[PDB]
Amino acid sequence: GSVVIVGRINLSGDTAYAQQTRGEEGCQETSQTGRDKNQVEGEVQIVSTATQTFLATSINGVLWTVYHGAGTRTIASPKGPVTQMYTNVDKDLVGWQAPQGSRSLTPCTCGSSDLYLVTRHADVIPVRRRGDSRGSLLSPRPISYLKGSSGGPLLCPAGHAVGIFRAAVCTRGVAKAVAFIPVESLETTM
Numbered sequence: 001g002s003v004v005i006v007g008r009i010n011l012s013g014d015t016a017y018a019q020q021t022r023g024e025e026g027c028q029e030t031s032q033t034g035r036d037k038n039q040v041e042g043e044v045q046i047v048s049t050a051t052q053t054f055l056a057t058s059i060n061g062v063l064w065t066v067y068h069g070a071g072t073r074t075i076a077s078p079k080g081p082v083t084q085m086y087t088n089v090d091k092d093l094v095g096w097q098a099p100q101g102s103r104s105l106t107p108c109t110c111g112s113s114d115l116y117l118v119t120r121h122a123d124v125i126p127v128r129r130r131g132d133s134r135g136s137l138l139s140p141r142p143i144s145y146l147k148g149s150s151g152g153p154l155l156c157p158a159g160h161a162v163g164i165f166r167a168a169v170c171t172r173g174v175a176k177a178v179a180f181i182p183v184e185s186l187e188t189t190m
Protein backbone atom coordinates (compact mmCIF):
# COMPACT_ATOMS: atom_id res chain seq x y z
CA GLY A 1 0.00 0.00 0.00
CA SER A 2 0.85 3.71 -0.19
CA VAL A 3 2.91 5.63 2.36
CA VAL A 4 0.57 7.72 4.50
CA ILE A 5 1.08 11.05 6.22
CA VAL A 6 0.20 10.67 9.92
CA GLY A 7 1.49 13.89 11.44
CA ARG A 8 4.01 16.69 11.21
CA ILE A 9 7.03 18.00 13.09
CA ASN A 10 6.34 21.61 13.79
CA LEU A 11 8.62 24.62 14.00
CA SER A 12 5.86 27.06 12.95
CA GLY A 13 5.57 29.26 16.02
CA ASP A 14 8.33 29.31 18.62
CA THR A 15 8.71 25.74 19.89
CA ALA A 16 9.59 22.47 18.13
CA TYR A 17 6.88 19.80 18.59
CA ALA A 18 5.22 16.81 16.93
CA GLN A 19 1.57 16.80 15.83
CA GLN A 20 0.06 13.41 15.16
CA THR A 21 -2.77 14.08 12.61
CA ARG A 22 -3.97 10.47 12.07
CA GLY A 23 -4.54 7.22 14.00
CA GLU A 24 -3.31 3.70 13.27
CA GLU A 25 -6.51 1.90 12.26
CA GLY A 26 -7.28 4.73 9.85
CA CYS A 27 -3.74 4.43 8.50
CA GLN A 28 -4.00 0.83 7.24
CA GLU A 29 -7.05 1.91 5.18
CA THR A 30 -5.91 5.11 3.47
CA SER A 31 -2.88 2.96 2.64
CA GLN A 32 -5.34 0.67 0.83
CA THR A 33 -6.85 3.44 -1.35
CA GLY A 34 -4.22 6.20 -1.32
CA ARG A 35 -6.93 8.86 -1.01
CA ASP A 36 -5.77 11.11 1.85
CA LYS A 37 -8.35 13.81 2.60
CA ASN A 38 -6.69 14.86 5.88
CA GLN A 39 -5.27 18.36 6.21
CA VAL A 40 -1.46 18.53 5.68
CA GLU A 41 0.65 21.50 6.76
CA GLY A 42 4.26 22.64 6.73
CA GLU A 43 7.72 21.40 5.91
CA VAL A 44 8.45 18.23 7.98
CA GLN A 45 5.91 15.38 7.84
CA ILE A 46 5.69 12.09 9.70
CA VAL A 47 4.77 9.37 7.20
CA SER A 48 4.20 5.70 7.76
CA THR A 49 4.03 2.48 5.88
CA ALA A 50 2.37 -0.62 7.36
CA THR A 51 5.58 -1.57 9.18
CA GLN A 52 7.55 1.65 9.65
CA THR A 53 7.33 5.30 10.72
CA PHE A 54 9.88 7.92 9.66
CA LEU A 55 10.01 11.52 8.41
CA ALA A 56 9.88 13.31 5.04
CA THR A 57 10.98 16.80 4.01
CA SER A 58 9.68 19.27 1.44
CA ILE A 59 12.32 21.37 -0.27
CA ASN A 60 11.26 23.32 -3.38
CA GLY A 61 8.20 21.33 -4.51
CA VAL A 62 9.48 17.86 -3.70
CA LEU A 63 8.72 15.84 -0.58
CA TRP A 64 11.94 13.87 0.01
CA THR A 65 12.51 10.89 2.27
CA VAL A 66 14.58 7.65 2.42
CA TYR A 67 14.08 4.73 0.11
CA HIS A 68 14.89 2.43 3.04
CA GLY A 69 11.66 3.63 4.59
CA ALA A 70 9.33 4.25 1.66
CA GLY A 71 10.51 1.47 -0.68
CA THR A 72 8.86 1.89 -4.07
CA ARG A 73 5.57 3.09 -2.59
CA THR A 74 3.24 5.78 -3.83
CA ILE A 75 2.12 8.35 -1.29
CA ALA A 76 -1.51 9.06 -0.38
CA SER A 77 -2.99 12.29 -1.74
CA PRO A 78 -6.46 13.85 -1.95
CA LYS A 79 -6.59 12.68 -5.63
CA GLY A 80 -5.18 9.14 -5.19
CA PRO A 81 -1.75 7.47 -5.11
CA VAL A 82 1.08 9.87 -6.09
CA THR A 83 3.93 8.01 -7.89
CA GLN A 84 7.58 8.65 -6.91
CA MET A 85 9.10 11.54 -8.87
CA TYR A 86 12.61 10.31 -8.07
CA THR A 87 13.96 6.91 -6.99
CA ASN A 88 17.69 6.42 -6.31
CA VAL A 89 18.42 3.18 -4.43
CA ASP A 90 22.18 3.80 -4.02
CA LYS A 91 21.65 7.20 -2.40
CA ASP A 92 18.71 5.89 -0.31
CA LEU A 93 16.47 8.50 -1.92
CA VAL A 94 12.85 8.98 -2.96
CA GLY A 95 11.03 12.13 -4.01
CA TRP A 96 7.32 12.75 -4.61
CA GLN A 97 5.71 16.04 -5.44
CA ALA A 98 5.17 18.24 -2.33
CA PRO A 99 1.65 17.38 -0.99
CA GLN A 100 -1.07 19.99 -0.94
CA GLY A 101 -1.26 22.15 2.14
CA SER A 102 2.49 21.95 2.69
CA ARG A 103 5.17 24.53 2.99
CA SER A 104 8.60 23.95 1.49
CA LEU A 105 12.01 24.81 2.88
CA THR A 106 14.67 26.86 1.09
CA PRO A 107 17.97 25.10 0.08
CA CYS A 108 21.00 26.30 2.12
CA THR A 109 23.40 28.70 0.33
CA CYS A 110 25.25 30.17 3.37
CA GLY A 111 27.62 27.18 3.64
CA SER A 112 27.53 27.37 7.46
CA SER A 113 28.91 24.31 9.19
CA ASP A 114 26.83 24.65 12.33
CA LEU A 115 23.66 22.63 11.69
CA TYR A 116 20.56 21.16 13.37
CA LEU A 117 18.93 17.76 12.98
CA VAL A 118 15.21 17.34 13.63
CA THR A 119 14.05 14.03 15.06
CA ARG A 120 10.56 12.56 15.11
CA HIS A 121 10.27 13.68 18.79
CA ALA A 122 10.64 17.39 18.05
CA ASP A 123 14.23 17.54 19.37
CA VAL A 124 16.39 19.94 17.33
CA ILE A 125 19.87 18.54 18.04
CA PRO A 126 23.06 20.52 17.32
CA VAL A 127 25.39 19.02 14.69
CA ARG A 128 28.71 20.43 13.46
CA ARG A 129 29.22 19.72 9.75
CA ARG A 130 32.17 17.40 9.08
CA GLY A 131 32.40 17.03 5.29
CA ASP A 132 30.19 16.18 2.30
CA SER A 133 27.60 13.76 3.73
CA ARG A 134 28.44 13.73 7.40
CA GLY A 135 28.14 15.64 10.68
CA SER A 136 29.23 15.12 14.27
CA LEU A 137 26.85 15.45 17.18
CA LEU A 138 28.00 17.82 19.95
CA SER A 139 26.50 15.43 22.49
CA PRO A 140 26.35 11.80 21.44
CA ARG A 141 23.11 9.80 21.92
CA PRO A 142 22.03 6.17 21.81
CA ILE A 143 20.92 5.06 18.36
CA SER A 144 17.41 4.20 19.51
CA TYR A 145 16.90 7.93 20.29
CA LEU A 146 17.09 8.70 16.56
CA LYS A 147 15.46 5.67 14.95
CA GLY A 148 12.36 6.83 13.14
CA SER A 149 14.03 10.16 12.27
CA SER A 150 15.31 9.28 8.77
CA GLY A 151 13.80 11.71 6.26
CA GLY A 152 14.05 14.70 8.53
CA PRO A 153 16.14 17.64 7.45
CA LEU A 154 19.38 19.01 8.82
CA LEU A 155 18.97 22.78 9.05
CA CYS A 156 21.45 25.62 9.00
CA PRO A 157 21.29 28.51 11.49
CA ALA A 158 18.74 30.43 9.32
CA GLY A 159 16.03 27.85 8.46
CA HIS A 160 17.36 26.44 5.16
CA ALA A 161 17.85 22.76 4.44
CA VAL A 162 21.33 21.22 4.05
CA GLY A 163 20.22 17.65 3.70
CA ILE A 164 18.07 14.70 4.61
CA PHE A 165 19.03 12.37 7.47
CA ARG A 166 20.08 8.95 6.14
CA ALA A 167 22.08 6.98 8.76
CA ALA A 168 23.93 7.22 12.09
CA VAL A 169 27.60 6.42 12.76
CA CYS A 170 27.64 4.20 15.85
CA THR A 171 30.07 2.35 17.96
CA ARG A 172 29.02 0.76 21.23
CA GLY A 173 25.42 1.58 20.22
CA VAL A 174 26.27 5.26 20.58
CA ALA A 175 25.87 7.85 17.81
CA LYS A 176 28.45 10.63 17.66
CA ALA A 177 27.79 11.45 13.97
CA VAL A 178 25.23 11.08 11.16
CA ALA A 179 24.97 10.50 7.42
CA PHE A 180 22.81 12.71 5.25
CA ILE A 181 22.02 13.29 1.55
CA PRO A 182 23.17 16.86 1.01
CA VAL A 183 20.93 19.34 -0.81
CA GLU A 184 23.51 19.64 -3.62
CA SER A 185 22.80 15.90 -4.11
CA LEU A 186 19.02 16.45 -4.47
CA GLU A 187 18.91 18.94 -7.36
CA THR A 188 21.56 16.75 -9.00
CA THR A 189 18.87 14.06 -8.87
CA MET A 190 16.21 16.39 -10.31
Ligand SMILES: C=C[C@@H]1C[C@]1(NC(=O)[C@@H]1C[C@@H]2CN1C(=O)[C@H](C(C)(C)C)NC(=O)O[C@@H]1C[C@H]1CCCCCc1nc3ccc(OC)cc3nc1O2)C(=O)NS(=O)(=O)C1CC1
Binding pocket: 052, 053, 054, 055, 067, 068, 069, 089, 090, 091, 092, 143, 146, 147, 148, 149, 150, 165, 166, 167, 168, 169, 170, 179
Ligand atom coordinates in the same frame (compact mmCIF):
# COMPACT_ATOMS: atom_id res chain seq x y z
C1 LIG B 1 19.24 6.91 13.68
C2 LIG B 1 18.57 5.98 12.72
C3 LIG B 1 19.03 6.13 11.30
C4 LIG B 1 18.45 7.21 10.51
C5 LIG B 1 18.04 5.81 10.24
N1 LIG B 1 18.71 5.10 9.19
C6 LIG B 1 19.06 3.86 9.30
O1 LIG B 1 18.80 3.21 10.26
C7 LIG B 1 19.81 3.32 8.29
C8 LIG B 1 19.10 2.32 7.45
C9 LIG B 1 20.23 1.38 7.02
C10 LIG B 1 20.95 1.23 8.27
N2 LIG B 1 20.92 2.55 8.87
C11 LIG B 1 21.75 3.03 9.77
O2 LIG B 1 21.59 4.14 10.21
C12 LIG B 1 22.74 2.23 10.24
C13 LIG B 1 22.47 1.77 11.67
C14 LIG B 1 23.39 0.67 12.01
C15 LIG B 1 21.12 1.21 11.85
C16 LIG B 1 22.71 2.89 12.65
N3 LIG B 1 24.02 2.96 10.21
C17 LIG B 1 25.00 2.77 9.32
O3 LIG B 1 24.76 1.97 8.46
O4 LIG B 1 26.15 3.47 9.44
C18 LIG B 1 27.06 3.37 8.42
C19 LIG B 1 27.96 4.49 8.24
C20 LIG B 1 26.80 4.36 7.34
C21 LIG B 1 27.04 3.87 5.93
C22 LIG B 1 25.85 4.17 5.04
C23 LIG B 1 24.61 3.30 5.38
C24 LIG B 1 23.64 3.21 4.24
C25 LIG B 1 22.32 3.84 4.50
C26 LIG B 1 21.38 3.01 4.01
N4 LIG B 1 21.04 3.11 2.74
C27 LIG B 1 20.14 2.30 2.26
C28 LIG B 1 19.77 2.38 0.95
C29 LIG B 1 18.82 1.50 0.49
C30 LIG B 1 18.23 0.56 1.30
O5 LIG B 1 17.34 -0.27 0.77
C31 LIG B 1 16.29 -0.73 1.52
C32 LIG B 1 18.63 0.49 2.60
C33 LIG B 1 19.56 1.35 3.07
N5 LIG B 1 19.90 1.22 4.31
C34 LIG B 1 20.79 2.05 4.80
O6 LIG B 1 21.14 1.98 6.06
C35 LIG B 1 16.57 5.53 10.68
O7 LIG B 1 16.15 6.20 11.57
N6 LIG B 1 15.80 4.66 10.06
S1 LIG B 1 14.35 4.41 10.45
O8 LIG B 1 13.58 5.60 10.43
O9 LIG B 1 14.28 3.87 11.79
C36 LIG B 1 13.52 3.13 9.29
C37 LIG B 1 12.10 3.35 9.21
C38 LIG B 1 12.96 3.76 8.11
Ligand SMILES: [Zn+2]
Binding pocket: 107, 108, 109, 110, 111, 112, 156, 157, 158, 160
Ligand atom coordinates in the same frame (compact mmCIF):
# COMPACT_ATOMS: atom_id res chain seq x y z
ZN1 LIG C 1 22.21 28.26 5.05
